[PDB]
Design a protein around this nucleic acid. Structure first.
Ligand SMILES: C[NH+](C)c1cc(NC(=O)CNC(C)(C)C)c(O)c2c1C[C@H]1C[C@H]3[C@H]([NH+](C)C)C(O)=C(C(N)=O)C(=O)[C@@]3(O)C(O)=C1C2=O
Ligand SMILES: C[NH+](C)c1cc(NC(=O)CNC(C)(C)C)c(O)c2c1C[C@H]1C[C@H]3[C@H]([NH+](C)C)C(O)=C(C(N)=O)C(=O)[C@@]3(O)C(O)=C1C2=O
Ligand SMILES: C[NH+](C)c1cc(NC(=O)CNC(C)(C)C)c(O)c2c1C[C@H]1C[C@H]3[C@H]([NH+](C)C)C(O)=C(C(N)=O)C(=O)[C@@]3(O)C(O)=C1C2=O
Ligand SMILES: [Mg+2]
Ligand SMILES: [Mg+2]
Ligand SMILES: [Mg+2]
Ligand SMILES: [Mg+2]
Ligand SMILES: [Mg+2]
Ligand SMILES: [Mg+2]
Ligand SMILES: [Mg+2]
Ligand SMILES: [Mg+2]
Ligand SMILES: [Mg+2]
Ligand SMILES: [Mg+2]
Ligand SMILES: [Mg+2]
Ligand SMILES: [Mg+2]
Ligand SMILES: [Mg+2]
Ligand SMILES: [Mg+2]
Ligand SMILES: [Mg+2]
Ligand SMILES: [Mg+2]
Ligand SMILES: [Mg+2]
Ligand SMILES: [Mg+2]
Ligand SMILES: [Mg+2]
Ligand SMILES: [Mg+2]
Ligand SMILES: [Mg+2]
Ligand SMILES: [Mg+2]
Ligand SMILES: [Mg+2]
Ligand SMILES: [Mg+2]
Ligand SMILES: [Mg+2]
Ligand SMILES: [Mg+2]
Ligand SMILES: [Mg+2]
Ligand SMILES: [Mg+2]
Ligand SMILES: [Mg+2]
Ligand SMILES: [Mg+2]
Ligand SMILES: [Mg+2]
Ligand SMILES: [Mg+2]
Ligand SMILES: [Mg+2]
Ligand SMILES: [Mg+2]
Ligand SMILES: [Mg+2]
Ligand SMILES: [Mg+2]
Ligand SMILES: [Mg+2]
Ligand SMILES: [Mg+2]
Ligand SMILES: [Mg+2]
Ligand SMILES: [Mg+2]
Ligand SMILES: [Mg+2]
Ligand SMILES: [Mg+2]
Ligand SMILES: [Mg+2]
Lengths: 63, 76, 51
RNA sequence: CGCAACCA
RNA sequence: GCGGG
RNA sequence: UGAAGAUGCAGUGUACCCGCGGCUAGACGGAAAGACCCCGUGAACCUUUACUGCAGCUUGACACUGAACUGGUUCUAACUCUGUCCCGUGAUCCGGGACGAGGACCGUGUCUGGUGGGUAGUUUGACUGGGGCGGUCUCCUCCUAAAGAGUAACGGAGGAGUACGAAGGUGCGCUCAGCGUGGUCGGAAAUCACGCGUAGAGUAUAAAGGCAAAAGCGCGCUUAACUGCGAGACCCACAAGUCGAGCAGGUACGAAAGUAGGUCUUAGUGAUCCGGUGGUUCUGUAUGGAAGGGCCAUCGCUCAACGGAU
RNA sequence: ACAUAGCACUCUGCAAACACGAAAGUGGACGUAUAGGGUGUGAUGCCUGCCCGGUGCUGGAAGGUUAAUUGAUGGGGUUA
RNA sequence: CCCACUGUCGUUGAAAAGCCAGGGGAUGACUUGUGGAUAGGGGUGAAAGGCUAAUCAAGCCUGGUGAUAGCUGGUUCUCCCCGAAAGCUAUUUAGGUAGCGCCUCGGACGAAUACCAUAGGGGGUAGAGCACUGUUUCGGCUAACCGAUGCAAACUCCGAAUACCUAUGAGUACUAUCCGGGAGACAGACUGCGGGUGCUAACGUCCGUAGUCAAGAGGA
RNA sequence: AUGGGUCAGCGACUUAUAUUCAGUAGCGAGGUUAACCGUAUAGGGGAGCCGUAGAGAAAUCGAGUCUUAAUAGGGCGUUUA
RNA sequence: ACAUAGUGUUGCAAGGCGAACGAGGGGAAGUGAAACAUCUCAGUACCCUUAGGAAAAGAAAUCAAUUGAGAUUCCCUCAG
């Protein structure tokens, strides 16, 4: 019947005006060894790559 | 069974911008392990000996000095 | 090996840095001057156990 | 050195 | 985490 | 010759058309989607000190479950009897009654520790000159690699899973290794002096590429091994990775121009989930709080089969 | 190969051990340790050595460790 | 009577286990009739995993049920246009799959693109050489050095052709980009050239590069 | 190497519901109703849905917003049927 | 001993079958997770008991949120 959202993916992607945003990996628990540059440049959101956008559209058909 | 099967991933080193090409500031010119090329005018060197353009202009390779060093420089 | 330690700001703010240290060649608690960005000022950070 | 606790 | 050496 | 053993292709030889009795050399003759071998993230049974349950067995707590004298000793009234007698009754079942023997035990329910191939569901990697055995699986350096990049083999060689509050920053200073010649042991080779000195020394560590403005070696002062960022690039399936001038703040060193966002560079590493600690006028299920969650910082994986299936 | 008479070990005191069954109950047995169950060996002759470290089993219980239970303490939240 | 040791035959049988000639037991732990009992993780078993209705490492029937099958097989009329790949990265992954590479359709935008000329570049290969690291022959000298003389994927004082990058230009080509829809494919083969491996073997194997086949008939 | 002795007949990309893209038709900064009522394919039913605004985890703000000490830089947005 | 248990006679009632649907008592596995144990499959198949023309539920010790609605059941939304 109704298409169902993949709820785990709906917690990783948010819809922007022309795409999706997401947080970056490698920023959870092993952080002393990483330089301040990698700490601060892995911080915010980024856009989902256009090669993943099709599968993200098939996984979250309502965002 | 022998003891040789290892190697490392490629590093993609080398000249990225050749002589005569136009660059903008921040463009990478040379990826090198040591300094087989040295920074001339309007060229900076990164911590891993990367030569990059600090200004717009055209790239020019030379041999200069009494040590016969290869130099990259950017003409503005 | 080298143990992980916090360097906590002695300014009241909860700011800290993390580093490693050799516990045998450096048993005393490390004290070093660093920039606290919550008060925007260099203060002294003292060693504390990683949490 | 043993007994017991183990669901990133 | 509880005792022994 | 050819998908590699031809009635059918090429060349060539032979052979009028058609039966019957024999025969089994071929038609890779018929028969049975090969049992051997391998594969499938099939299956079934079986095993065990594989994992995880459960039955059963067992431990204690509470309940049924009480009274005295002091953990016992005694009692009887709960309860038990697959003991005797009576009745229902024409009855070795069962029930009631009487007695006898036990007896607050045993036994049963709920909770709980142990045991538990008895039974159950499952798991038990891949690569591979078949598979197994052995070896390997992630990262760094060189060669193969065909003068941009990239480039395989169970091809040829080696390293890593760290170290360091100085071995980082800065200002100032310095220049080896080897030879000769002399000089207390002391000597081919220690330290001293003098002459050369072709880079052959050194570099925390493997190799390569570097290294005189030394990137090598010392001394003084120090914390830029900073916070917010970041034009623009390189490399890239993605996820990641790399370099970065400049700008703001706060610094260190320097008289000053300046130089510093760790270390000559390239190895020294692990996603997500779940959770911990610090901070936080973000949230707070009627409301005010709180719990809990979010955000920023950080911690916990030989998840080494190193994109990690539980 | 199996069984076998014979042998040995071991369990079992009778509402027996053990088995079947969800329980009631039934077998064992209308038997009672010269009996009944399990295990191995296998007429008979001559015999059957050493090892208790491992895994079982049996006995012991001084100490350590340890469940449910119980709930002393301490810490937080709310607000008169 | 019960059984089934040997052999021949039979093997689309007379027969889904027999006949025939011989064989064993034949008062016993015997054979046998009638009736009854034990039922599927169960029964029964002088134990072969034997037997339980020609079915047994878990019976048969029905139902769950159209179980699931990354595996085989099959997939039905016509014409026209274009037209691949057998690669990389990852994967309990290797005969599966996913992103990218390669195809097609629609839209946008049009020389941005390609070929060639010229110009500007950086190489460390072929060859060469011995300046370094190794290795090597002879001779001189008191081992180092010197003269002569060879060799090298992991040697270099040197060093092409090609290839690659950028700019400018003539001519010739619906070129190149970008945004969407749909894919297939990820077993490749041979030949030449440059190599690793092997025996400077293999219609061997593994790479790079071009062509062909794959998916291409015709002539030799 | 596989499958087919032969013929005839039967025999394999469906249906529902969502959703995305393309075509086409209506209406158009708007479009459209669902159950349901209804001699009933009409008509009524506006509840809802999509579009018209984004930024931020969120509170919040809004052609901007987030990050920040910064009104600097940067991210995502801002004509868009 | 009283009585009760038991026994008998009479009276009325019930039992069985049959489509689905209801309510209740029990309750899988194949499968999916590209393995599998939590989870899914699914309170489904199936077994059992028992109704009615329907059953069940039902008249707030309910929701809501700045002080509203007003038993139960079913349909569309909210909303994947
Ligand atoms: C042009 N050459 C002849 C030259 C000239 C001068 N002189 C000057 O410029 C100043 N004095 C002059 C102008 C001559 C009067 C020179 O000063 C030098 C040199 C040569 C270099 C060579 C260097 C070389 N490396 C380090 C690049 C080298 O390897 C050697 C060597 N012997 O192996 C050198 O000697 C070198 O280091 C060196 O010293 C040079 C000069 O000093
Ligand atoms: C250390 N510097 C100051 C130096 C000095 C001298 N000469 C002296 O010391 C003079 N000797 C005295 C004391 C005056 C008698 C030197 O002679 C040298 C050098 C430098 C080296 C550098 C070498 C370098 N690589 C191999 C490490 C290199 O690649 C080059 C290059 N041009 O590319 C060289 O020139 C180098 O090989 C070389 O020759 C050096 C010297 O000769
Ligand atoms: C020309 N260059 C390449 C050169 C070559 C050699 N030759 C060798 O070392 C040869 N050695 C072999 C055998 C090849 C290994 C040389 O030997 C030299 C030099 C450089 C000169 C320069 C001299 C110079 N003059 C002006 C006195 C000078 O002033 C300096 C300086 N300021 O540093 C020098 O270094 C100089 O004196 C010098 O030493 C040179 C050489 O020795
Ligand atoms: Mg965090
Ligand atoms: Mg050099
Ligand atoms: Mg014939
Ligand atoms: Mg014959
Ligand atoms: Mg024949
Ligand atoms: Mg055959
Ligand atoms: Mg087969
Ligand atoms: Mg098992
Ligand atoms: Mg299963
Ligand atoms: Mg394998
Ligand atoms: Mg290359
Ligand atoms: Mg090349
Ligand atoms: Mg020199
Ligand atoms: Mg997990
Ligand atoms: Mg509240
Ligand atoms: Mg919090
Ligand atoms: Mg793996
Ligand atoms: Mg892996
Ligand atoms: Mg025996
Ligand atoms: Mg004997
Ligand atoms: Mg006979
Ligand atoms: Mg006889
Ligand atoms: Mg069965
Ligand atoms: Mg049974
Ligand atoms: Mg057997
Ligand atoms: Mg079975
Ligand atoms: Mg089927
Ligand atoms: Mg064509
Ligand atoms: Mg087009
Ligand atoms: Mg050569
Ligand atoms: Mg593949
Ligand atoms: Mg392949
Ligand atoms: Mg190939
Ligand atoms: Mg071949
Ligand atoms: Mg093909
Ligand atoms: Mg042809
Ligand atoms: Mg031809
Ligand atoms: Mg065949
Ligand atoms: Mg056939
Ligand atoms: Mg037909
Ligand atoms: Mg299951
Ligand atoms: Mg599965
Ligand atoms: Mg599966």
């Amino acid at each position: 019947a109704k298409l169902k959202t993949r709820r785990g993916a709906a917690k990783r992607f948010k819809a922007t005006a022309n795409g999706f945003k997401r947080k970056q990996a490698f920023k959870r628990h092993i952080l002393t060894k990483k330089s301040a540059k990698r700490i601060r440049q892995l911080r915010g959101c980024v856009m989902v790559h256009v090669s993943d956008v099709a599968s993200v559209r098939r996984m979250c058909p309502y965002i | 069974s022998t003891k040789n099967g290892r190697d490392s991933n490629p590093k993609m080193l080398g000249v990225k911008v050749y002589g005569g090409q136009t660059v903008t500031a921040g463009n990478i010119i040379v990826r090198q392990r040591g300094t087989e090329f040295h920074a001339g005018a309007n060229v900076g060197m990164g911590r891993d000996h990367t030569l990059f353009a600090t200004a717009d202009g055209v790239v020019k390779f030379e041999v200069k000095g009494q040590f016969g060093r290869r130099y990259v420089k950017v003409e503005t | 090996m080298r143990d992980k330690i916090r360097l906590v700001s002695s300014a009241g703010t909860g700011y800290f840095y993390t580093t490693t240290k050799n516990k045998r060649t450096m048993p005393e608690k490390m004290e070093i001057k660093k920039f606290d960005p919550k008060i925007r000022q260099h203060v002294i950070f003292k060693e504390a156990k990683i949490k």
